[PDB]
Design a protein around this nucleic acid. Structure first.
Ligand SMILES: [Cl-]
Ligand SMILES: [Cl-]
Ligand SMILES: [Cl-]
Ligand SMILES: [K+]
Ligand SMILES: [Mg+2]
Ligand SMILES: [Mg+2]
Ligand SMILES: [Mg+2]
Ligand SMILES: [Mg+2]
Ligand SMILES: [Mg+2]
Ligand SMILES: [Mg+2]
Ligand SMILES: [Mg+2]
Ligand SMILES: [Mg+2]
Ligand SMILES: [Mg+2]
Ligand SMILES: [Mg+2]
Ligand SMILES: [Mg+2]
Ligand SMILES: [Mg+2]
Ligand SMILES: [Mg+2]
Ligand SMILES: [Mg+2]
Ligand SMILES: [Mg+2]
Ligand SMILES: [Mg+2]
Ligand SMILES: [Mg+2]
Ligand SMILES: [Mg+2]
Ligand SMILES: [Mg+2]
Ligand code: NA
Ligand code: NA
Ligand code: NA
Ligand code: NA
Ligand code: NA
Ligand code: NA
Ligand code: NA
Ligand code: NA
Ligand code: NA
Ligand code: NA
Ligand code: NA
Ligand SMILES: [Sr+2]
Ligand SMILES: [Sr+2]
Ligand SMILES: [Sr+2]
Ligand SMILES: [Sr+2]
Ligand SMILES: [Sr+2]
Ligand SMILES: [Sr+2]
Ligand SMILES: [Sr+2]
Ligand SMILES: [Sr+2]
Ligand SMILES: [Sr+2]
Ligand SMILES: [Sr+2]
Lengths: 194, 119, 237, 46
RNA sequence: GCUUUACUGCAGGCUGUCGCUGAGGACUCUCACUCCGGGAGGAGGACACCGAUAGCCGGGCA
RNA sequence: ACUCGUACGGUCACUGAAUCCUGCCCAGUGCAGGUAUCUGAACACCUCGUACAAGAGGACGAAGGACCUGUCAACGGCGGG
RNA sequence: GCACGGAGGCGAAGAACCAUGGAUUUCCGAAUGAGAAUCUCUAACAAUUGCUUCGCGCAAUGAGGAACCCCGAGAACUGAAACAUCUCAGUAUCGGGAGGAACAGAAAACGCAAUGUGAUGUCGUUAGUAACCGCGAGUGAACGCGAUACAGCCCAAACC
């Protein structure tokens, strides 16, 4: 039979219809009055969080982060540039907003490590994502068969090096064949042409 | 709230929890939104309880309509930890379902009746 | 070229800032719950550095000492009232709705409770014309008919210090002293007198703006100089 | 000027260092302070 | 370095459109959103701000 | 920032105390206003095309321009016969 | 001790010297009770977090390191015999971050099209080939193959 979770999932396929639509209209009013990174005791999208590795356990944290919508907030050149390098308006950054969200969340909790994150909507001027963070120092996690892997030293500050699921996607690592000639094993090893 | 379409009087709620308490001691009941949901889908549910202080609301938003298209009666409880306590849990419960009561069928039946009446 | 003076202003460096640390207070109306049960006694008359006009120090019943934007005719000892039921006399503040049509008012609020925005300069005054249950009409000093919420508070009388502008500065030194009390860079070097690199009008053998002075409203900063979006110029016609 | 206690310690050290290489070091090494400083001709730090 | 009706572009301003954004070629409303208010509450209001894009101007800048 | 500021203000420019004065010109250029009609992009819409799409065309048409008016203490001009 | 002096001393109670382990280890310094040009003033995980006996009780972070590595920001001189796309170049330089190596990695792959291969780096080659380009100057892979080394697994959900 269908899991209760499937229902949360199905509601979020069309956040603009049904009860969910009404919920968002209500919630966002409060979110707009909240800070940049708000820790929350429970994921707004349980199914999604559990699917990404979330667990109701000690050392598991969830935080919502909001980021301004739009392209790059860039300053026009103050020195000589050929027409090609004078652009300012239509230039966009290479990291998607979800990634910027994961990094701000991780800065807020220096001791925690980003596990994954997912979207929870947006209005006209900002986007919200919830980020799952894990405490690599808590024994309840050090003893977890599904999460202890994130306790290894080489996982420290994983988000800042693009090791996140959103990080790997944004780096063009999804495809294993055609089109990934310059993304794998890293953007840098491939001269930064990916 | 967005899934709540009627307020259940403190008294009616009092009886329901009692019926649930005797239900677990006698008959059979499910604890947890997932188990509650499968009961309604499997049709093995007679009366389903749904807290009103559930945040996020997505967790139980589906119960109401899923029950109506299953004839299964449902009722709202104000607190979340009461439903859990009445269900015999040391924690809370966003939803519960009486899977075939026990020596409470009469009451469980009336409570349901009083609900339909309450629209 | 280089940024013009108008652009240096925006950065708010000391050279362009007002001597705020020397300013006294912001003559905003008092806030009263309701009833008008507020009256104070003019304890003194002072000089307001930021406006070159006098200000009246008042002591209210509830024990609050605050400077007020004084109209002409207020003196020590006098008693002032602030509230809906305030008496209709010079120096008193109350919502337009309570003021009788045809009465000169000053320090008029733009939005009820903001403290006063219009007609605060020396010797000026707004003229309350039309009354209503939805809109109070006031003729501002510029001659413009302004539509305000009848709830906007105001003070009866014209602002103190009228005629200040009738006497010429006569000498640069006098202008100097006044400019030192404002957020203004003075003296003023003409654009035509500067190098091309410094202003749209700079450059050329003899001084002259090698271009028409009437500039478009859409012009970017650095280029918007001269006669901004003029509907006309000169005195003719 | 006005010297703090720490500044004083540093000036003191500079003064001490500003001495001759002991005569006995000459013999022992069978044959000069390269850090010799003059108050006027030179300039200390700070 | 400087100039301009040199070439080519870039900011910036104006303007249409899409998203924010709701209810009943002109209209009402309130619930988002904005503003005033210490507060109650008042004003405004699906506009404005903001994100995107399109046309015009654009030696202010390269 | 201006601004503890509010048109007797403060921003942008020109001329350069007082005194007597400051003519004619709105065609070009600039600014501003208006504008039946003409022109005027994208989205949505319509036709053709494509089992879809590319694409071609249409209808509607904002600012802007055409056009009209105002303005020289606005750029400037006041000749030859 | 360098350091070949003078004086004096230590060493058979086995010194010097070397190896391993331990002791001591001022002040400033991430510098962390507050402040300060290395000092001063009156009990200290300052600050941000996790857990929490909700008490700094238990813990984490911070800064460094030759380069290497990963994630972001990103020129111009120069070449094109000028120059704007292109080039120099994702180079220089900047922000953030990990390790002893990083990153990648068990196919929604490949497409010598097959009755075929079978995670991923890397090396040799495929090849200056395909592809790009005021189709100019220039830019420039991949599959495969020969090698190196080889390794494959864990969740979400269903049912409990
Ligand atoms: Cl991290
Ligand atoms: Cl003045
Ligand atoms: Cl093959
Ligand atoms: K170049
Ligand atoms: Mg398992
Ligand atoms: Mg590599
Ligand atoms: Mg004031
Ligand atoms: Mg000054
Ligand atoms: Mg001058
Ligand atoms: Mg000169
Ligand atoms: Mg210039
Ligand atoms: Mg002149
Ligand atoms: Mg001495
Ligand atoms: Mg405000
Ligand atoms: Mg130039
Ligand atoms: Mg002159
Ligand atoms: Mg002169
Ligand atoms: Mg210290
Ligand atoms: Mg060249
Ligand atoms: Mg390139
Ligand atoms: Mg050529
Ligand atoms: Mg290249
Ligand atoms: Mg291939
Ligand atoms: Na972190
Ligand atoms: Na690319
Ligand atoms: Na000296
Ligand atoms: Na030069
Ligand atoms: Na003319
Ligand atoms: Na030591
Ligand atoms: Na610590
Ligand atoms: Na603590
Ligand atoms: Na050349
Ligand atoms: Na050249
Ligand atoms: Na090219
Ligand atoms: Sr770190
Ligand atoms: Sr609970
Ligand atoms: Sr004010
Ligand atoms: Sr105020
Ligand atoms: Sr000139
Ligand atoms: Sr005239
Ligand atoms: Sr000297
Ligand atoms: Sr004169
Ligand atoms: Sr004209
Ligand atoms: Sr293998």
């Amino acid at each position: 039979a269908r899991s209760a979770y499937s229902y949360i999932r199905d509601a979020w396929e069309n956040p603009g219809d049904g009860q969910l639509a009404e919920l968002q209209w209500q919630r966002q009013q409060e979110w707009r009055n909240e800070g940049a990174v708000e820790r929350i005791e429970r994921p707004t999208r349980l199914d999604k969080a559990r699917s990404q590795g979330y667990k109701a356990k000690q050392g598991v944290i969830v935080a919502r982060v909001s980021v301004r919508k739009g392209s790059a907030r860039k300053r026009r050149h103050k020195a000589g540039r050929r027409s090609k390098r004078q652009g300012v308006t239509r230039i966009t950054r290479r990291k998607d907003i979800q990634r910027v969200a994961e990094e701000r969340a991780s800065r807020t909790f220096p001791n925690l490590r980003v596990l994954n994150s997912y979207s929870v909507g947006q209005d006209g001027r900002q986007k919200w994502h919830e980020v799952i963070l894990i405490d690599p120092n808590h024994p309840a996690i050090q003893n977890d068969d599904d999460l202890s892997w994130i306790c290894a030293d080489d996982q420290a500050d994983r988000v800042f090096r693009g090791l996140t699921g959103a990080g790997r996607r944004n780096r063009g690592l999804s495809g294993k064949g055609k089109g990934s000639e310059k993304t794998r094993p890293s953007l840098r090893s491939n001269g930064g042409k990916a | 709230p967005v899934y709540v379409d009627f307020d259940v009087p403190a008294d009616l709620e009092d009886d329901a929890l009692e019926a649930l308490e005797v239900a677990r001691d006698t008959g059979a009941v499910k604890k947890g939104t997932n188990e509650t949901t499968k009961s309604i889908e499997r049709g093995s549910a007679e009366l389903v309880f749904v807290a009103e202080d559930v945040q996020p609301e997505e967790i139980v938003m589906h119960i109401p309509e899923l029950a109506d298209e299953k004839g299964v009666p449902f009722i709202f409880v104000e607190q979340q930890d009461d439903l859990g306590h009445a269900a015999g849990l040391e924690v809370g419960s966003a939803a519960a379902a009486v899977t075939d009561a026990g020596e409470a069928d009469a009451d469980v039946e009336d409570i349901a009746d009083k609900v339909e009446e309450l629209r | 070229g280089r940024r013009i003076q108008g652009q240096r202003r925006g950065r708010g460096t000391s050279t362009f800032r007002a001597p705020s640390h020397r300013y006294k207070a912001d003559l905003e109306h008092r806030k009263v719950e309701d009833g008008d049960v507020i009256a104070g006694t003019v304890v003194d008359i002072e000089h307001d550095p930021a406006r070159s006009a006098p200000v009246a120090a008042v002591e209210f019943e509830d024990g609050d000492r605050r400077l007020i934007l004084a109209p002409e005719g207020v003196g020590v000892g006098d008693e002032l009232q602030v509230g809906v039921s305030a008496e209709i006399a010079p120096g008193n503040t109350l919502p337009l709705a309570e003021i009788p049509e045809g009465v000169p008012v000053c320090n008029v609020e733009s939005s009820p409770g903001d403290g006063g925005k219009f007609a605060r300069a020396s010797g000026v005054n707004a003229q309350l014309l039309t009354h209503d249950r939805n809109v109070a009409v006031v003729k501002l000093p510029s001659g413009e008919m302004k539509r305000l919420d009848p709830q906007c508070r105001a003070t009866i009388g014209v602002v103190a210090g009228g005629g200040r502008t009738d006497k010429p500065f006569v000498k640069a030194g006098n202008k100097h002293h006044k400019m030192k009390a404002r957020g203004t860079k003075w003296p003023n070097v003409r654009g035509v007198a500067m190098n091309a690199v410094d202003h749209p009008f700079g450059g050329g053998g003899r001084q002259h703006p090698g271009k028409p002075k009437s500039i478009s409203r859409n012009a970017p900063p650095g280029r918007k100089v001269g006669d901004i979006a003029s509907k006309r110029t000169g005195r003719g016609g | 000027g006005k010297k703090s206690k720490a500044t004083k310690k540093r000036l003191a050290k500079l003064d001490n260092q500003n001495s001759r290489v002991p005569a006995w070091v000459m013999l022992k090494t069978d044959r000069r302070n390269h850090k010799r400083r003059h108050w006027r001709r030179n300039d200390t730090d700070e």
